[PDB]
Design a protein around this nucleic acid. Structure first.
Lengths: 85, 157
RNA sequence: GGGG
DNA sequence: TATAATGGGTCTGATG
DNA sequence: CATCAGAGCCCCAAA
């Protein structure tokens, strides 16, 4: 029943979502170059904020524990950038 | 649909007594009223380049392929020529029949009037929009908002 | 499935 | 690692 | 009026 709540994608929104996902993937590569941080770490912090404060945990593979404190520091180091970055 | 903004200069000859004087003409505004049919005649030699808008048309004579005259036919002007036609000087191009006025999708910036006997030759600084439609497909995405003024070479899709 |  | 594939197979007594 | 927990002992050969 829960699965039937989410409508099936049209060929357009199928390509749109798949497209936005691939662009976001590249936006974290180009974002680790600028910031000079770990790609994986960045992409996790991007997840922390989209999913919500319900999930927050130490992702084994990453080097810095993911407590609300260190995500806020990386969310500010992100917001600290010029409009073009 | 991209409403492309064109801004050129064009002319038109009317009976001086049928022409209402104004330093500009907003869309739909009356430009002249003729008590009888008056044949807007050609004043240059060349091959016609008809360009019909929504209402009202353009008409560009050329020698070789260099433009030599650009005429403007407002509403009320039925063109008596076809595209690519050869016109000798003085041959009637269109016909005005009573009230003629600017089309809705085009306006007159400046207006310059030279008088010559019982007529006026208007040099209208016209600016209008010519829409072109583009079909968009499922593999493609529109990267431009509604009302976004684009310059040449910009990406829309 | 039998015994008591 | 790439056709497309998108919703399963008795029998009684005490307690809320 | 529905849901859950009870409903004898020991022994054998089988599986």
């Amino acid at each position: 029943h829960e699965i039937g709540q989410v409508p099936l994608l049209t060929l357009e929104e199928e390509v749109e979502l798949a497209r936005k996902v691939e662009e976001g993937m590249e936006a974290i590569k180009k974002l680790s170059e600028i910031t000079g941080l770990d790609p994986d770490l960045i992409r996790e912090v991007v997840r922390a904020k989209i999913l919500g404060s319900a999930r927050v945990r130490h992702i084994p593979g990453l080097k810095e524990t993911l407590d609300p404190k260190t995500v806020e520091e990386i969310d500010q180091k992100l917001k600290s950038l010029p409009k073009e970055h | 649909r991209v409403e492309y903004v064109k801004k050129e200069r064009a002319g038109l000859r009317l009976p001086l007594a049928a022409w209402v004087e104004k330093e500009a003409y907003k869309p739909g505004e009356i430009l002249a009223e003729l008590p009888e049919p008056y044949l807007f005649r050609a004043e240059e030699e060349g091959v016609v380049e008809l360009k019909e808008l929504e209402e009202g048309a353009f008409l560009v004579l050329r020698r070789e392929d260099e433009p030599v005259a650009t005429y403007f036919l407002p509403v009320g002007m039925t063109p008596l020529v076809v595209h690519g036609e050869i016109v000798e000087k003085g041959q009637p191009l269109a016909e005005a029949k009573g009230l003629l006025r600017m089309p809705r999708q085009v306006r007159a910036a400046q207006v310059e009037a030279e008088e010559e006997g019982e007529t006026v030759y208007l040099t209208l600084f016209l600016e209008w929009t010519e829409p072109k439609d583009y079909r968009v497909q499922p593999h493609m995405n529109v990267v431009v908002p509604e009302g976004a003024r684009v310059e040449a070479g910009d990406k829309i899709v």
